Structure formats: C-alpha cells, structure tokens
Amino acid sequence: SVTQTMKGLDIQKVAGTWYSLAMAASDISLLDAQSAPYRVYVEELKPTPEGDLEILLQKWENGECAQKKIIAEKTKIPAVFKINKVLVLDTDYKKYLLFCMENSQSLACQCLVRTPEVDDEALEKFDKALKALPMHIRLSFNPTQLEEQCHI
Amino acid sequence: SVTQTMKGLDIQKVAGTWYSLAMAASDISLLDAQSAPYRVYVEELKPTPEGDLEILLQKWENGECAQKKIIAEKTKIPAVFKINKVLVLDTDYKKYLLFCMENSQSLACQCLVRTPEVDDEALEKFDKALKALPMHIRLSFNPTQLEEQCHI
Ligand SMILES: CCCCCCCCCCCC(=O)O
Ligand SMILES: CCCCCCCCCCCC(=O)O
Ligand SMILES: [Cl-]
Ligand SMILES: [Cl-]
Numbered sequence: 001s002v003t004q005t006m007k008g009l010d011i012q013k014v015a016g017t018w019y020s021l022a023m024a025a026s027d028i029s030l031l032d033a034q035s036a037p038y039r040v041y042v043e044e045l046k047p048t049p050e051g052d053l054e055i056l057l058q059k060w061e062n063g064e065c066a067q068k069k070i071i072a073e074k075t076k077i078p079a080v081f082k083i084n085k086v087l088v089l090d091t092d093y094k095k096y097l098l099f100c101m102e103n104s105q106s107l108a109c110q111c112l113v114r115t116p117e118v119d120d121e122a123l124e125k126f127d128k129a130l131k132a133l134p135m136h137i138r139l140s141f142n143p144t145q146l147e148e149q150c151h152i
Numbered sequence: 153s154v155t156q157t158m159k160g161l162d163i164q165k166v167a168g169t170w171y172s173l174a175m176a177a178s179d180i181s182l183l184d185a186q187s188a189p190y191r192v193y194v195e196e197l198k199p200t201p202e203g204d205l206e207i208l209l210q211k212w213e214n215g216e217c218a219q220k221k222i223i224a225e226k227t228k229i230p231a232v233f234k235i236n237k238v239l240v241l242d243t244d245y246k247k248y249l250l251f252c253m254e255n256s257q258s259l260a261c262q263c264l265v266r267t268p269e270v271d272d273e274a275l276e277k278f279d280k281a282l283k284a285l286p287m288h289i290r291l292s293f294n295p296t297q298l299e300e301q302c303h304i
Contacts, residue, residue, distance in 0.1 A: 028291060032184050138290040139180060 002100045002107070004089045004129055005079040011047045013093040018042045018112040019146045021119065022126055024135040026107040031137045034060040034150065038101065038108035041151055043067070050074075053081050058150045065150035089129050096122035098129055107133060116146040154252045154259070156241045156281055157231040163199045165245040170194045170264040171298045173271065174278055176287040178259040183289045186212040186302065190253065190260035193303055195219070202226075205233050210302045217302035241281050248274035250281055259285060268298040 020041045025031045030038040039060065046054035053072040058065050072081035079088040084103050091097035096119060097112040111126040113119050123140070130138070145151040172193045177183045182190040191212065198206035205224040210217050224233035231240040236255050243249035248271060249264040263278040265271050275292070282290070297303040 136292045136294065140288045142288065 001105070002087050002089070002102060002109075003132060004087075005077075006088045006090050007079075009079045009088055009091070010093070011051060011053065011074075011078070014045050014053075014088075014091060014097060015047055016114075017044055018097060018114065019116055020110050020141065020151065021113045021146070022111040022123060022138065022140040024109050024126075024130050024133075024138040026105065026134050026136060028137045030106060030108055031139055034152075038106070040068075042110065042112055053086075060150045065152070090125060095119065096125065098122075098126055100133075107135075109133065109135075116143045118143065153257070154239050154241070154254060154261075155284060156239075157229075158240045158242050159231075161231045161240055161243070162245070163203060163205065163226075163230070166197050166205075166240075166243060166249060167199055168266075169196055170249060170266065171268055172262050172293065172303065173265045173298070174263040174275060174290065174292040176261050176278075176282050176285075176290040178257065178286050178288060180289045182258060182260055183291055186304075190258070192220075194262065194264055205238075212302045217304070242277060247271065248277065250274075250278055252285075259287075261285065261287075268295045270295065 023031055025038050030036055041058040042055065043058060044056040048054060051074045055070045055072060057068050057070065059068050070083065072083055072086050075082055084101055087100045089098040089100060095114055098109065100107060100109040109130065111122055113122055141151045175183055177190050182188055193210040194207065195210060196208040200206060203226045207222045207224060209220050209222065211220050222235065224235055224238050227234055236253055239252045241250040241252060247266055250261065252259060252261040261282065263274055265274055293303045
C-alpha cells in the first residue's frame with residue numbers, strides 16, 4: 001500500500017482552487033486515455049463543517065469534459081477519506097498537495113498545486129513519494145494545459 | 153535538444169536482443185495510446201558491416217501488433233543515426249542501452265535492457281538522463297508484459 005501520510009492535517013486549510021500538475025498510476029490503463037478511469041482533474045476542494053471533503057473535478061467522458069461533484073467521507077484517521085481510499089501524503093496548504101487513491105491493487109497519485117505554474121520542488125516531493133510505489137505511468141501538464149478544461 | 157551521447161560507441165556490440173523497459177516523451181500524445189506514434193517496442197538491432205543500423209520493432213496499428221524492419225542511417229557522428237535523429241545516450245552493451253528519437257520539437261527516449269527483468273540501476277540512469285529533458289509522459293513495463301507482443 002501507500003506508507004506516507006500528512007501528520008496533523010488541517011482539512012479546512014486545503015479548501016479552494018487546485019491544479020492537477022502531475023499524475024501517476026500502478027497500471028498504464030488507469031491514465032493512458034483522456035477517458036481512462038483515474039484521469040480526473042481536481043478544480044476545487046470544499047471541506048464540510050462535519051469534516052467530509054466535497055471535490056469538484058473535470059472528467060472527459062462520452063467525448064466531452066464533464067464537471068463532476070464527489071464526496072470523500074472522513075474516517076477513523078485524519079489524512080484518510082473514503083468514496084476507494086484517498087490518502088493525503090503531504091501538503092503546505094499554500095503551494096502543493098500530494099495525494100493517492102487506492103482501491104481493493106489499482107493506485108493513482110497526483111501533485112496538486114495552487115497556481116498554473118510548473119513547481120519543481122513540488123514535482124521533486126512527488127517523485128520522492130512515488131519512488132516507494134509500483135507506478136508504470138506518469139503524466140505532467142504544462143501551464144497552457146492547466147488553464148484548459150480537461151487539460152487539453 | 154538532447155545534450156547526452158555515448159563516447160566511443162561500438163555499434164557492432166549493440167547487436168542482438170533488447171526489451172523496451174521504459175519509454176518517455178515530450179508530449180502525452182506521442183505514447184498515451186497502444187497506436188501512438190512513438191509507442192514502438194524494440195526486438196533486435198542488426199548493425200550492417202557498412203555501419204548502418206537495421207532495427208526490428210513491434211508497432212500496434214489497425215488493431216494488431218505488427219513486426220516492422222527499419223534502417224537508421226549512420227551520420228558524421230558515431231552515436232547519431234538518421235531515419236528523425238536517433239541518439240545513443242549511454243550503454244554497457246551487456247545489460248542496458250539508453251536512446252532518444254527527436255524530429256524537426258517531438259522527443260521520445262527509451263531504456264532498453266538485454267533481459268526481461270526490472271533493472272533499477274538502468275531505470276536510475278534513464279531518470280538521470282530524462283531530468284535534463286522536457287518530458288510529460290513516462291511508461292514502464294513489467295516482466296510479463298516484456299515477454300508479450302506489443303507488451304500487452
Ligand atoms: C485531500 C485531497 C482530495 C483528493 C481528490 C481526489 C479526487 C478524486 C477521487 C476519486 C477519483 C475518481 O472518481 O476516479
Ligand atoms: C542504437 C539504438 C537504436 C534505437 C532504436 C530506435 C527504433 C525506433 C526509431 C523510430 C521509431 C518510429 O518509427 O517511430
Ligand atoms: Cl473509519
Ligand atoms: Cl551526416
């Protein structure tokens with residue numbers, strides 16, 4: 001599984017606007033196509049007062065880019081949420097957030113960033129985090145693509 | 153461009169059987185689909201006595217895995233061949249070979265290995281080599297997939 005988790009995570013401080021700067025997955029089929037199952041682009045995190053996590057994302061399907069609203073239910077553990085588990089690996093709230101989704105084992109991780117900008121330090125932390133994980137596909141987006149619906 | 157090249161390359165010593173262990177590209181569309189243009193799997197390098205390079209590869213197209221024979225013409229420079237330029241970055245002849253293809257700028261690099269085995273040292277050299285290059289997609293294959301036509 002994923003052996004890395006943010007201690008003392010303040011879910012309220014991750015609210016707002018994020019960009020899916022990089023994505024990686026255990027299996028090529030999870031991200032290879034615009035419509036692959038883990039090819040989802042984060043737009044906004046809406047934490048509830050009850051401590052759950054409403055996610056706004058983009059997902060390409062039936063040939064166009066759909067906006068989708070998902071709920072990740074809090075758990076026993078603070079850096080873990082359920083839909084499929086969502087684990088928050090690391091974040092500084094103001095610049096970057098790393099997270100992984102795992103089922104059952106299918107696994108996908110992203111480097112979220114606050115601005116439409118290539119952040120090398122945050123890409124570095126993502127790479128370090130991935131070293132320990134059995135990834136077979138990695139994608140990254142350029143600033144033009146970050147400002148486009150479904151990163152086209 | 154690519155700023156890395158094997159000094160003193162003995163083209164005759166790269167003959168024989170190779171496996172496409174990892175691939176990376178400047179643009180997602182160059183490797184994302186089974187039929188993407190730089191998604192080609194090396195099977196065998198046949199150097200000519202004239203010093204050219206006959207390549208046997210697999211390429212998925214019109215829904216099946218085709219065997220294709222290509223000629224890379226030698227140039228002024230020994231670690232450079234022409235079809236699109238092919239640059240040999242590094243090789244130890246017995247275990248791994250790193251190479252890049254560039255046009256015009258579209259760029260794709262592979263980590264070839266001699267055996268159907270995950271070679272971490274060779275994946276490390278590939279990563280180091282890629283750091284200096286503007287890659288946005290990376291793929292890697294497992295030993296089951298290395299023994300299959302078109303790595304399925
Ligand atoms: C705390 C960060 C929340 C991470 C956002 C995850 C959004 C996608 C989760 C499930 C993706 C899917 O529906 O395939
Ligand atoms: C010296 C190593 C030779 C490298 C093998 C390159 C094979 C593919 C080159 C062109 C690929 C294509 O046809 O798209
Ligand atoms: Cl729980
Ligand atoms: Cl020449």
